[PDB]
Design a protein around this ligand. Structure first.
Ligand SMILES: [Ca+2]
Ligand SMILES: [Ca+2]
Ligand SMILES: [Ca+2]
Ligand SMILES: [Ca+2]
Ligand SMILES: [Ca+2]
Ligand SMILES: [Ca+2]
Ligand SMILES: [Mn+3]
Ligand SMILES: [Mn+3]
Ligand SMILES: [Mn+3]
Ligand SMILES: [Mn+3]
Ligand SMILES: [Mn+3]
Ligand SMILES: [Mn+3]
Ligand SMILES: [Mn+3]
Ligand SMILES: [Mn+3]
Ligand SMILES: [Mn+3]
Ligand SMILES: [Mn+3]
Ligand SMILES: [Mn+3]
Ligand SMILES: [Mn+3]
Ligand SMILES: [O-]
Ligand SMILES: [O-]
Ligand SMILES: [O-]
Ligand SMILES: [O-]
Ligand SMILES: [O-]
Ligand SMILES: [O-]
Ligand SMILES: [O-]
Ligand SMILES: [O-]
Ligand SMILES: [O-]
Ligand SMILES: [O-]
Ligand SMILES: [O-]
Ligand SMILES: [O-]
Lengths: 266, 266, 266, 266, 266, 266
């Protein structure tokens, strides 16, 4: 079960309004790698774990924190949309506002009454296909490192897309939390790799066709990847290199379908 | 530019038909973490790189290889759909085929003429939201390790979802290529982390609020995550632990919108 | 069956072109709460009814009217796109059109030849997930009141987003029809609630855990909702209030899955 | 900010596993009118309100409660998926499981390791297009009554889709909470209608073309809707009736576009 | 404007129920190439035309007819869902219904109350990305031929997916109407090609690099396409053939981005 | 299997940067009728063909060529995005850039680091619903002609949306390839229509209700379509014309559902 306090985890108030920045911050709210993705991924993984409490609890702790970040980004967008221009009265007050209006999300005013959406900057709805919860935490802790990496890259970019020190104060807090999250998820990843194996899943080495498992195959005519040849991979075995990969599988010849399908193919 | 040969990279022919397995393999063709996601992600990242040839060429090599895997999965699905039941004549021939029909994708017959789709097992279209190309290869090589990890987990599951030795032969090849891809992307990741930093992006340490960068925050009442307290994180600094995270940001109070919005909120 | 006349239900011609307003009006054509949603919802519900003709016919009457509104919005958008700028020759004519171009939907010209799309202002395709037809008209008449409420709110906003008297004339007609539709659907709602009950569905009172049916639970630390305590609800029973909701269900513990799933969770 | 406890709001454990029922309950987790829709809609509306605390707090209270229901449905699905069949070893063990496998979501095993998804029963991803937050609480409290109405209808149907008394115990609780939520949102609706008006938005009566605001228009040739003629609408005015609605707007004639568009239309 | 009659264009009643066939027919209602796609495409194109009345009227005539077909398919699905099994009480009166339940769309009962959806057989929502209206009727009449071709192929397949003579009677009518629609759209296509040219658009021959306009390029190593060499194309010019197409464009080298983007690429 | 060369099929470098043109070109990369649609459609159809090598090889040759075009469009977008404005420091340098920034896709910088996406100009993700592969090549060759027609229309429009002669040189090449592809697919279409029939599928004439197969039905009150009356259709039979189409199928009445569904409809 959850409980809520009205106080934000950390400040989320800009020094001044900016509806263009509000639109950019929709990426962190409703985007592919944003806070809603983190919230739903970590809570899903946490609820689905039957394993060690160390990781189950880490996931539920962090998913719950991400809900605080969803709240912060939402709040920041709302403050940034204060007094935003949306019609002829605004243009009569200051005709230069036409440029601002051109760059805004039309739906911020029309659909939401100058409030945040749960979409990205381009109005694409957040959706569950952005979420990963596979049942395997070696894989999913790697996913979580990536989620925080892609997110922290975006927050870093956002920092250079505003000069508002109130906006930047919030971003500086989020950058630091994303450092913590990257590090905690890397530690879990490394512990799980030691337990189960460096390759996911770790119990398939006998089954796989091992002769192809350490061969770098040169399918594009640049030769840059040849630098991996002879380097030692993380499992202790060296990469070999094939300059001219071979097509070993034959020519497909599937049986034509039943006439009731009307597969007229010449 | 690309060129094509009709020969497959490796065998993709089952010993017998199985339209239920064909539906499962749609995950590997049109699903979230499948071969189309790999193909499009690696090609995109490769095209978008202005950096080291070692990595640009690796990405183009591997993206091109994934096109061969898309071709293999497509081919295997087509063979597995041979003679699949789709109407009353088939049920008259063998009434037990009703169970098979109930588990099939209705669109395999109706839309595609007993051929593969570019959807997942549930008919959800493959879409570009599954693809990541960010401009930062520290982040994206981590993504690529995840893509191969989630994929190889699924391929491993598929191995236990059939007893067909022809299907399994293909899967054994793919498992091995996914081991190679996991390892080559991990090596690139490790080199890029040494160059740029273990936190992504590596050039924001002074900007972030460092006091919060190594604190584990206990938001869920389980205590499993306390086991991280005092462990040395990958950047050389120990994690600290906060039993009772504090709401530091105040209660938001956003300004009411202009009357032309009709924001009647009480 | 349907028949069509080329004459519009009501005027849908603007005094002047304005491709920014055209983009806004895509909300009314292809958006979440727009006229296509109304058309498809009311027709679907009407076709699905096996009940009283008073309501079945109301739904078919109104769904058919909404088709006329779809036609009007489409027509208005096409007029509004007349002479819209789309390339260098327009900027040679009037360099000040750059601002207009920046705010336009790029697809209006490129994809549609300066004609309406079936997308919202952000290019998101209209989709059937916007439509409700459940089989229960107590629920669905409430939905229809909502549909007309959200739509009329948007139409009201649009009125303040232009000074064009021809656009406003059309909007004044739609506002009036939306008043009628809100009222007719509220009357149906109330008649259906008298027949079946104020709670949907009205035949589950013995089954539900009545102990929890009138309790306001305080999950967020604001105390504003305590004002509802002791007020009489629409069914004649007073609300009680719980300042500290209890977690009554225990800590879940699901069985670890079969090893064929490779659920490595620590 | 939020905090989490591992204890569930109410019991969410079935007496027996049933992966077909797990698939149905995906509607309540990831579907159009499910608990994620409630959670995100009420939180969004609550965060976006600058108005009376009575309603802002009610929304945040209830949105936070819905997160507990998301957790319960997720948990129930996980328990229901225990020991679910997914490959040849299960059919070797008990060939009668083929019917169960045919009805399952293939991704429950393959993607999630016999855990819940954030999709509906058909694998369609939950998405933000299911959420409404408009800025007007007269409209949105009506939406919330609908959300709880469509949901409680689905929960009622689910009750008749299982004989498991453990599942039914959870459903009986949810039915009761949905009664409370319907009633509280109706009370807010009633207060807001008394304040602002029965038509949403309530400040446009002078602007609309009033001559069309109370006319029932007969567009479908059934006569059932004539029963509304002469009835008093909720705003105190009687409905009139038009047996033959007229097309008042003329035949549109839009200007042909610039030749650079290549609009070759004959 | 539109008007509606309760009488269907043609019979749409099955001899007996069949919820599996109901699910198949969702392709014709909510699928990619189904009746909703035809309705919305032809109406959109018709509204958007400023050209010859012969074609504008044909489009509006046919789009309006397709609305009747939407109505018929919806009706047929509702009849086919009569008495469909959905819970434990159905299996008790007849246990052989288990296979039927396994093959049904779970949402037909749960969401819609045993009524049609606006989704395809897999639950994927109909969406406007299935619709084409480009402004060029040489292109769009070709699209319309295709829409009727793909649809009639599906109807033909459906004919072999049931033995119900009432279902078949409806399909025999639709097959005939799709013959008419293919033929009328082909006639329009041919007239428009005579007026504007066989290549769309017909006014770019001077602009294009003509040396590449009639060359078959052999990118896949099969030699089957060599059979086109020397054949006369529809514009009166012979195809030539290139066995080894050449990469003529150089190796791209794009400029690295500004450091504020953090594009760390090695 | 595939192989890649770093050299482009044809030049794809602009004379100057232009991030607005970059956004337009996203239509050709990630849009409905763009190069990814062609690539995936032709490869899918080619892999799925069991018929004549002339057409199977044509499809694989062309699908492979379209991969080169995807690469070209990607490259062109990346060059066009060089030095694009994205933050306050750019506006300090030149305040005039505000108009450019307003028209840009915010995700080009924020998500991709000033690189191409796999979305259309509005940020809508490319998806597999844009792809057709049906099993019948009479239908699908028609689709392919359409694909190349809609695409060449868009490329022709793009030609009038820039004055950059480097962009135009690329477009001139693509126009010529689209002429070739339109012609080769029309030739295949013609040959297949001679073999199987002018109506798709060509083996249903006895089954369909022939009396309705050549009747133009006047559902919209314009009279333009009467011009088809008496013209000879492509199968050699004349069209007839029905001024007042009749509703022949009666008024349906579906049985009310079981009470367990709670279908309260009045
Ligand atoms: Ca290489
Ligand atoms: Ca904890
Ligand atoms: Ca409270
Ligand atoms: Ca009527
Ligand atoms: Ca060839
Ligand atoms: Ca006509
Ligand atoms: Mn965060
Ligand atoms: Mn985080
Ligand atoms: Mn692969
Ligand atoms: Mn791989
Ligand atoms: Mn309307
Ligand atoms: Mn209305
Ligand atoms: Mn609930
Ligand atoms: Mn509720
Ligand atoms: Mn039709
Ligand atoms: Mn038709
Ligand atoms: Mn091309
Ligand atoms: Mn082409
Ligand atoms: O975070
Ligand atoms: O985060
Ligand atoms: O791979
Ligand atoms: O892969
Ligand atoms: O309306
Ligand atoms: O409406
Ligand atoms: O609830
Ligand atoms: O709920
Ligand atoms: O049709
Ligand atoms: O049709
Ligand atoms: O092309
Ligand atoms: O193309």
């Amino acid at each position: 079960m959850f409980k809520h306090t009205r106080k934000l985890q950390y400040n989320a108030k800009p020094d001044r309004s900016d509806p263009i920045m509000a639109r950019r911050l929709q990426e962190s709210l409703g985007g592919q790698w944003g806070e809603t993705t983190g919230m739903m991924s970590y809570l899903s993984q946490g609820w689905a774990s039957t394993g060690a409490e160390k990781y189950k609890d880490l996931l539920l702790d962090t998913g719950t924190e991400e809900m605080a970040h969803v709240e912060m980004i939402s709040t920041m967008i709302g403050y940034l949309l204060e007094d935003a221009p949306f019609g002829p009265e605004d243009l009569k007050r200051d005709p230069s506002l036409a440029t601002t209006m051109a760059g805004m999300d039309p739906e911020h005013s029309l659909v939401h009454g100058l409030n945040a959406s749960l979409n990205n900057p381009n109005g694409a709805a957040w959706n569950a296909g952005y979420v990963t919860s596979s049942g395997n935490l070696v894989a999913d802790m790697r996913f979580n490192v990536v989620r925080e990496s892609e997110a922290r890259l975006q927050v870093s970019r956002l920092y250079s897309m505003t000069e508002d020190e109130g906006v930047r104060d919030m971003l500086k807090f989020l950058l630091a939390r994303e450092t913590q999250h990257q590090l905690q998820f890397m530690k879990a990843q490394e512990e799980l790799e030691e337990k189960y194996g460096i390759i996911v899943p770790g119990d398939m080495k006998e089954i796989e066709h091992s002769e192809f498992s350490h061969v770098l195959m040169n399918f594009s005519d640049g030769d840059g990847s040849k630098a991996f040849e002879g380097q030692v991979a993380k499992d202790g075995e060296k990469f070999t290199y094939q300059e001219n990969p071979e097509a070993m599988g034959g020519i497909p010849h599937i049986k034509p379908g039943d006439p009731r399908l009307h597969n007229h193919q010449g």
